[PDB]
Design a binder for these strands. Structure first.
Lengths: 161, 160
DNA sequence: CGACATGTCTCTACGTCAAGATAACTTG
DNA sequence: CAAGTTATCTTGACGTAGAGACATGTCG
């Protein structure tokens, strides 16, 4: 029995008026996200000098195509964090020399965050190591099992939408 | 296309030398965990005056049975957080009157964190709402799909 | 226009990790 | 005993939400 299953057995004993079965799937979802980030993905980003959120900004800039420049709002909408938290991520990356701010010509309120050449070289390198890492994380599942997990998670996400 | 699928399409265009397929399942895993906690689970805990980690401690104490008393170590092992972070959680709950610290008779180094009557009443109500909340969250999946999701996540966790 | 909305940062306040401290426990 | 380990808290550092501030964009 894993953590989620054992916790459900305790609740079945302590509150027989309750059906706590839902705790298994959602507990394992939470635990999987935490463990995979903490033990597998984040140490790799750290070897490149990046926090996970910093890797995410560089990846979002890079995959958006030349000239690898996005507004803070596009970045925080993509990252699903607050505007102020995105300011902090940009500040860290800017000080490290991986991105550069400039005025957005399209909007007087705006800023464009752009990859530097050094930032682009870093993420171009890290993304390959990252995907290799992700594949190893998933290797306990067959190809078909990974596809079905992706489908089940999409159905669950569409449910929230 | 959802967020993960669109991100993968961008990578396929920008780095055709790369196979970014793994990003779909792991991106959706991360997004699902965040969105469900942010939009569904954590607001409910807040209605009871609890942070998610505080709910978790009270739940761990309650489900362990009378006298609902566990050591900080048993708690932080169950929560998968560090010892110092568990101190903070206990501090918040104790100040709020939901738990009480006492010396552990079994270990001179140790403490027992125990539910108060008010803390037990709080978690006994909140856990019912929480389970109702979880079931609605999962209602987009059939019973068989939820079982399959649970099995696939267990296989993935054992892999780690 | 003035009223309202948005982009973005600054700021407070909090949960978190890891390192360190130290009393007490374990081991041999 | 003497050395090593564990329980637990304290502490510095950092990411985070979201309120607030303010310049600039949008609306009738």
């Amino acid at each position: 029995m894993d953590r989620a299953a054992h916790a459900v057995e305790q609740w079945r004993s302590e509150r027989p008026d309750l059906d706590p079965s839902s705790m298994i799937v959602l507990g394992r979802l939470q635990e999987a996200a935490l463990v995979i980030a903490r033990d597998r993905l984040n140490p790799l980003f750290a070897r490149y000098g990046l926090q996970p959120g910093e890797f995410d900004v560089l990846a979002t800039l890079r995959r958006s195509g030349a000239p690898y420049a996005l507004t803070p709002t596009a970045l925080y909408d993509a990252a699903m964090i607050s505007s102020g938290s995105m300011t902090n991520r940009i500040d860290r990356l800017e000080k490290a020399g991986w991105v550069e701010r400039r005025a957005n010509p399209a909007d007087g309120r705006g800023t464009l965050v752009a990859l530097t050449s050094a930032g682009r070289a870093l993420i171009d390198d890290a993304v390959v190591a990252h995907v290799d890492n992700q594949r190893r994380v998933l290797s306990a599942l067959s190809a078909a099992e990974q596809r079905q997990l992706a489908k089940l998670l999409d159905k669950l996400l569409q449910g929230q939408a």
